[PDB]
């Protein structure tokens, strides 16, 4: 019985999802009221469900049963409404546009590393993996420096998974919205060089984002740019520190960075599972009776370790090529921010290993502290030794 809120999943979700992949790769469970769900752990079956038009991302198809901007973003839409919303933001994440951010991201990395070099130890989360994506997002969205401390408080509170804090989370949502509504108003009138201005002025086939569509879009982008990108950097650093022979390869040959980032995505699966998927009708898959309204959980972490698709899947190989991981999902909803996550990872891992060639883990395996989150696999802290 899969228990995503249980101790074993918190200790190592990869080993739980892997056991399901080998023993019961299509598994019915109850997600805690309670709601029926299916856990899909093999790569081939994950692919089939990612392409299957019997699966919706919009829970209305199945109900049966403001801050409404939070659940109206494009990742909660199917075609054709998804297609329009994606075409209105797409241009913000094309290869040149994102590549053009390189110099600014390098500068943030080097500034954070200058602070870390004042000492011979650090918590990589506090010092480097958490602040870097936050500053990148802040710069990209044009959040003035005087507003960043506050923006950090809101963005942290508004994604809290603690069920009991729901009124307080809703409040932070409302405050985030009011803040961005002021920026949107101001930039519609006087546009600047930032992504809120660019979204406000985007038009495609005669259509623009409405005020509410802007709230939803900026909400989604900010949430993505923060905790999950942080987790790439944190968990990727951890994986490099646990695999010294692969760390040394990359340190000696930084041209390996592009394959290395893809391997770290595969092995660390920052989004370890994803759901928010429902069957629109009853159907059978491999003898299993899927029902209208059943939720589908896509086991990224285990799919990324499936030996039908990856050789020696449990081994970190920073030169793995090709590497057809699904860490960014697949198909319609494939991550929009993938080039930015990849650029941040490229810059950050190279920069850290250049500045601190002697970096080493300063926490025993049993003491490593992971955040409580079913879907997002992320460290609470990451103590390291930097130098003597
Ligand atoms: C390592 C970092 C990241 C990982 C692993 C990641 C992973 C994912 C995954 C798995 C999906 C598909 C979710 C589903 O289908 O349920 C997704 C979608 C998306 N991601 Fe990311 N993401 C990352 C960073 C970012 C960043 C930096 C941004 C933007 C700032 C972003 C923006 C989006 C958006 C807008 C979508 C929805 C796309 C659509 O519905 O068409 N992501 N991402």
Curated annotation (Swiss-Prot):
Gene3D superfamilies: Cytochrome P450. This is Polyketide biosynthesis cytochrome P450 PksS. Pathway: Antibiotic biosynthesis; bacillaene biosynthesis. Belongs to the cytochrome P450 family. Signal peptide: none annotated. Its EC number is 1.14.-.-. It comes from the Bacteria. GO terms for cellular component: plasma membrane. It is found in: Cell membrane. GO terms for molecular function: heme binding; iron ion binding; monooxygenase activity; oxidoreductase activity, acting on paired donors, with incorporation or reduction of molecular oxygen. GO terms for biological process: antibiotic biosynthetic process. It comes from Bacillus subtilis (strain 168). The chain crosses the membrane at residues 214-234. Heme binds at residue 335. The gene is pksS. Keywords: Antibiotic biosynthesis, Cell membrane, Heme, Iron, Membrane, Metal-binding, Monooxygenase, Oxidoreductase, Transmembrane, Transmembrane helix. Involved in the metabolism of the antibiotic polyketide bacillaene which is involved in secondary metabolism. The substrate is dihydrobacillaene. It is a single-pass membrane protein.
């Amino acid at each position: 019985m899969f228990h995503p809120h249980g101790k074993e999943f918190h200790h190592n979700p990869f080993s739980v999802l892997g056991r399901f992949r080998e023993e019961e790769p299509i598994h019915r469970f109850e997600l805690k009221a309670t709601y029926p769900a299916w856990l899909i752990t093999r790569y081939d079956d994950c692919m089939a469900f990612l392409k299957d038009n019997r699966i919706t991302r919009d829970v209305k198809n199945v109900m049966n049963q403001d801050i409404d901007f939070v659940s109206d973003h494009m990742l909660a839409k199917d075609t054709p409404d998804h297609t329009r919303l994606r075409s209105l933001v797409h241009q913000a994440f094309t290869p040149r546009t994102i590549e053009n951010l390189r110099g600014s991201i390098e500068q943030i990395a080097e500034q954070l590393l200058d602070e870390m070099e004042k000492e011979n130890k650090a918590d990589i989360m506090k010092s480097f993996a958490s602040p870097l994506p936050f500053i990148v997002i802040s710069e990209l969205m044009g959040i003035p420096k005087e507003d960043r401390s506050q923006f950090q408080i809101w963005t942290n509170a508004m994604v809290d998974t603690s069920e009991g804090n729901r009124e307080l989370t809703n409040q932070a949502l409302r405050e985030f919205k009011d803040y961005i509504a002021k920026l949107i108003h101001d930039r519609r009138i006087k546009p600047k060089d930032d992504l809120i201005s660019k979204l406000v002025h985007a038009e495609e086939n005669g259509s623009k984002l409405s005020e509410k569509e802007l709230y939803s879009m900026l909400f989604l982008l900010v949430v993505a740019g923060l905790e999950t990108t942080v987790n790439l950097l944190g968990s990727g650093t951890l994986a490099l520190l646990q695999h010294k022979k692969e760390c040394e390869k990359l340190k000696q040959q930084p041209e390996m960075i592009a394959t290395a980032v893809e391997e770290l995505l595969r092995y660390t699966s920052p989004v370890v599972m994803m759901a928010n998927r429902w069957a629109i009708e009853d159907f059978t898959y491999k003898g299993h009776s899927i029902k209208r309204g059943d939720m589908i959980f896509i086991g990224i972490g285990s799919a990324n370790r499936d030996p039908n698709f990856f050789e020696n899947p449990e081994i970190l190989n920073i030169n793995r090529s090709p590497n057809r991981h699904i860490s960014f999902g697949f198909g319609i909803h494939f991550c929009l921010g993938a080039p930015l996550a990849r650029l941040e990872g490229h810059i950050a891992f190279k920069a850290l290993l250049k500045r601190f060639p002697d970096i080493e883990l300063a926490v025993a395996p049993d003491d490593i502290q992971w955040r409580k989150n079913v879907f997002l696999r992320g460290l609470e802290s990451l103590p390291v030794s930097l130098s003597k």
